[PDB]
Amino acid sequence: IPRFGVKTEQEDVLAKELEDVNKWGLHVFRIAELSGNRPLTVIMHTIFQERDLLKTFKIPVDTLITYLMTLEDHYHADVAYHNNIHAADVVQSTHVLLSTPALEAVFTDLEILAAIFASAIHDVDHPGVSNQFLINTNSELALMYNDSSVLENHHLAVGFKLLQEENCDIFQNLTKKQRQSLRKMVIDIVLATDMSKHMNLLADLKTMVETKKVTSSGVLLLDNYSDRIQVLQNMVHCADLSNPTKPLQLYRQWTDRIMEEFFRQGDRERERGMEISPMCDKHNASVEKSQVGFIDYIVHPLWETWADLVHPDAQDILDTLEDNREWYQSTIPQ
Amino acid sequence: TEQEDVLAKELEDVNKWGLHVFRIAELSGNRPLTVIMHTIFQERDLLKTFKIPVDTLITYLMTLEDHYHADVAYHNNIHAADVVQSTHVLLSTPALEAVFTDLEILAAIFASAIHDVDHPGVSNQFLINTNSELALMYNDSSVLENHHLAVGFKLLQEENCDIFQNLTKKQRQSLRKMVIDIVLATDMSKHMNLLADLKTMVETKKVTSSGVLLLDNYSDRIQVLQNMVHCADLSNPTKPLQLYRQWTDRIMEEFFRQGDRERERGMEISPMCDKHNASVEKSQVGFIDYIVHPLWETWADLVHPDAQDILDTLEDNREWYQSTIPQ
Amino acid sequence: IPRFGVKTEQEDVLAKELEDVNKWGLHVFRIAELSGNRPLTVIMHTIFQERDLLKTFKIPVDTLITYLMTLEDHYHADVAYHNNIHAADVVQSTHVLLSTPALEAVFTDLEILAAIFASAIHDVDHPGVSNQFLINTNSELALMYNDSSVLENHHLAVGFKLLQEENCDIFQNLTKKQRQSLRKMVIDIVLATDMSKHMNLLADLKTMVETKKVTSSGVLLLDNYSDRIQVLQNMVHCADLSNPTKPLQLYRQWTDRIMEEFFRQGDRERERGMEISPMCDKHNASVEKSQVGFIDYIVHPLWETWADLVHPDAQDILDTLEDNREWYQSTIPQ
Amino acid sequence: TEQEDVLAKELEDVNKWGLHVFRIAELSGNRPLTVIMHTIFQERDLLKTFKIPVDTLITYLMTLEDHYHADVAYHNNIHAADVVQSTHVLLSTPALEAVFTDLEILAAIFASAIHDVDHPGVSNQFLINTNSELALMYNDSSVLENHHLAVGFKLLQEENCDIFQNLTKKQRQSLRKMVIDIVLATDMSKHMNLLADLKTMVETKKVTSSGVLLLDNYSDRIQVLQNMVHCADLSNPTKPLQLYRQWTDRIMEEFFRQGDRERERGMEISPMCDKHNASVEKSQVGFIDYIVHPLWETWADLVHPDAQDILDTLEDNREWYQSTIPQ
Ligand SMILES: COc1ccc([C@H]2CNC(=O)C2)cc1OC1CCCC1
Ligand SMILES: COc1ccc([C@H]2CNC(=O)C2)cc1OC1CCCC1
Ligand SMILES: COc1ccc([C@H]2CNC(=O)C2)cc1OC1CCCC1
Ligand SMILES: COc1ccc([C@H]2CNC(=O)C2)cc1OC1CCCC1
Ligand SMILES: [Zn+2]
Ligand SMILES: [Zn+2]
Ligand SMILES: [Zn+2]
Ligand SMILES: [Zn+2]
Ligand SMILES: [Zn+2]
Ligand SMILES: [Zn+2]
Ligand SMILES: [Zn+2]
Ligand SMILES: [Zn+2]
What we know:
hydrolase; cAMP; homotetramer; PDE; binds zinc ion; 60% helix; mainly alpha
């Protein structure tokens, strides 16, 4: 029954931080500390209230919080990058992207709910290792998902499964039609987060930009499920790949975390007598170069395309990415 | 005794299109998949090539066959034996002579044998609509096909059932990836794509100085195997009318049963599952015209003219059913 | 199945057979036939209405029918004995046992609900082979349940799991308290149907009958949970082992079905080179002898003890058992 | 290597009851389970005896230890290492010399190693109340223990992890049964009877020629093994005070975190899990008085007098905590 979803006497400082919920560059780490490591629960609660999703979908308030806490409890606290903080961050970034001027009134509430819920569960119960590692070891997960998008299929199943715990079904008052539509979009979005799908996603996105249509209002025209879900997929995907576009201070912390996680896998791999995966070798690591390359061949190409689709709404995000790209470049030891 | 002699006579057509699979099922005490698989395995000296202890092969086959539903009219062990035998025939076609390795041959055959294991008699969509545990587990995507794979492989783990116990790590690794690629291709929701990309291949077709089809990379190799097994799965209409008619009676019984269940549950009845407003004859012609014939005609172009006789039996059965529609 | 609010031919016939639902010896096989192979759904529905369980527990009728059909759909039609007709039989039998005068007003509606629900799901998804066969073949079911009460654990897991399919949660309106109590009782009852528990289960029933206490009206007195659940467990165990107490005409059909199922397992075991389980070899079977043994060592000792518990309430039932015993005895070919 | 020596030195106590398991955890890069298990397996020549390839042993150990949650304060790889090492010491109790076969010894050490694998840091009742997937799968009965067994055995199926590959079908069947019997008995709800039967076995106690414990039937042999591992799992209070207080701090951190989770959810806060109404000291004394002491009193009363030093340490530790009880 508390103000932001959880109990905390630093509630005033947290309240002040959550004022930036609609802003790119939210101090998600401070919010994580101030909420007692409940960034996903408080940030989702704030966004649901802000968007009036509880009333619109008849979600009892206690059910929402029980589910959110349950969901957050299933992200691993010992995983440096793919944890609840990353989940909270993607949820909040997706929230900002959905509010872009070029997309106003374009998506329905159910579609908005789907993008946000998808963002919240997109990495749930991530072991801290890649699909390839899960595949090489013949893990039960790899076997159940026939080696195809193992982690991603797993994130979805868990997200939906938790809905079944006590007082966790936040979709209990949606009609069958709403639940099927929602479920489909969510699945379509989370499966798209698998990096092995990046190129085809980006390709289709560019195509859409090439044939970009806008209504009498200055907003994007999306006439069919295919184009709609495609935008939602690239949106969430952009949010999942938005670290380099945040204020350097936040970006650098994500870099330290993604590397700390990659090195754990690297170590675990050499212990098991496996070939150390790329960028997972703390002994042969070029953190800076790696980040620059990540931007040059992945992040910038994606955000440059998204920027065109919603031009000029994302111009500042793109400028920050470039400023950050140059910082790391200047950090590469020679 | 008399039983063995009759069954052995029938097993003699194992390499021919039109095997009396229904007779074999009867005579083998309902073990058509086990007897036909073992038959084919010896016929291809597969037990020797991959050093598969015989007792282990029979144990696994009976196990796999046991996980096919006896109460399911169409998607049962007979269908499985049929797709296995049919793929066995397509593998021996002239244009593919000496093309595939013993390992790839094993994969297409294994894939065929498990492609529908533990089939419940209802479609993916029915399992999705009812929120089945299976659908939730595979996120509504190729639900049954993913399950067929999982069961097929998991069954290798039962007592004295690992028929790949002697294959090397590299072999197992390669087999697993091909079977997954093959079975997942059986999902009809992926028919249009397979057929479209199969035609694209026939247009860039490349025959070697041996008159045999040339397949360089894995992508080309697998696509042919996926389509081969896909044609085998969709071969009922190209078989002798005697068999084809039985397959039709069986699939309709299964579809009608799904419709009765949907009617029970108040769900909307699926197309061709309403026993009160059905047109079996008409549906069969439509199935051949928009799906079966379009596909088998493409396969004919790839192995021209190896499948000419199959393609003619289809057009023939097509007419038989057409001249059956009342007025 | 009806037509214009007025019943159809078969339904009427089914309705007239269902009038003996409160009687020992219902023509359950005729009902299976008349109901289009839906004996479990029709009998469960008849009983829920008779005991007013839908109003008492606010179960929407459509939800109940949907779950019942779903539950019945998970019993294997290709299994001769452990199928939906058996489930229906144990349900109707438990139902008759609950109405014994010696137990009037003893149990609450929740306990009555648990006894009935447990009966309905007690053998769901039975594969037609024993626990030992699943253990010796290293089935995944055996692995999942660590070879302990494999099938009984599975029956339970499936029975509860089905409540989660579309519009199948018949307990959606019970409070958490009612659900946790119902669930514990159902679990305790079903796990007790494992024959390996028979001896200890019977020992405690006798012990209870030894210390039997009545309210000078015949009405048994069950204070604590330990005695209440024990009686319920034994009740459903009796229903499960009630075939030998039904009119011979019914009993013989059950005997033919169990033998068919046992012989099939033997066939599979002989195929697989496994040793043939007791009474599973069709080439060396003593059907009449086996039934005699089954009655003398298991069924008669159980029912005689139950006869004592509710005496004289089960005198007729015991009389039928002994008569069927003699009949089978005189049938043994010398 | 500078530390490799220190670690190797610390390992000179692998056979001593009081090993600084925490030190081994640090010096080994947090691989106390893999390290202790390897040392002990060689210590007993288990590798050669059962023909267990070193690779497969280390790979499974790392794979097993990796499924222990590093975020959990008490039920983690360190606790697992401690229980393996402890069971190891007890197995060497003179009153048991030559009593157990190598397969029975492997069974008790393996069980120990996986007895808490994949523990989420919350109790069975917490999983039951929340309607967790695990509880629904295991029907609220020994939920976690069933899970610990499942994961322990399943991890043998991963890449080069099956350490029991070279065992006959008879060995494997017996090992599996024994392990299951041991881990399932670690469920505290099984405590009262497990102790009851242990006492009875001590009354009718009987020794052989050498004067070593006489265990005829499986029932008795497994009962001794079940209780042995149970004592190892309930051995914290019997270790030197320094180690004991570390464990106490650890269980309490875990318990309070559950209480915090129960409180966030408006759930009833479980006994001793409320950091606002805690009696850490009084609870340790109650734990020793009503559970740990009666248990160890009987064990030492079965391996008389090998566990005398242990029992006395326990009693000393109890008094220390008792003096820390406010009021
Ligand atoms: C903070 O930077 C990164 C931020 C986010 C990611 C996600 C994309 N794929 C993943 O597995 C995680 C990778 C990053 O760095 C990668 C680029 C170079 C090395 C790792
Ligand atoms: C030979 O009959 C058929 C045999 C096999 C199939 C497979 C294709 N999809 C399935 O689910 C099974 C369809 C048939 O015809 C059906 C299509 C229209 C009516 C029946
Ligand atoms: C009425 O027949 C029987 C009906 C029901 C059972 C249950 C008890 N155990 C089971 O596996 C099923 C046994 C029967 O008789 C058996 C005893 C000897 C041969 C078959
Ligand atoms: C070192 O202390 C303890 C050590 C070990 C345990 C086992 C018993 N249950 C578990 O989950 C672990 C309890 C302890 O103390 C408890 C007793 C009273 C409060 C906590
Ligand atoms: Zn991800
Ligand atoms: Zn992510
Ligand atoms: Zn299929
Ligand atoms: Zn098929
Ligand atoms: Zn049963
Ligand atoms: Zn039964
Ligand atoms: Zn434990
Ligand atoms: Zn433990």
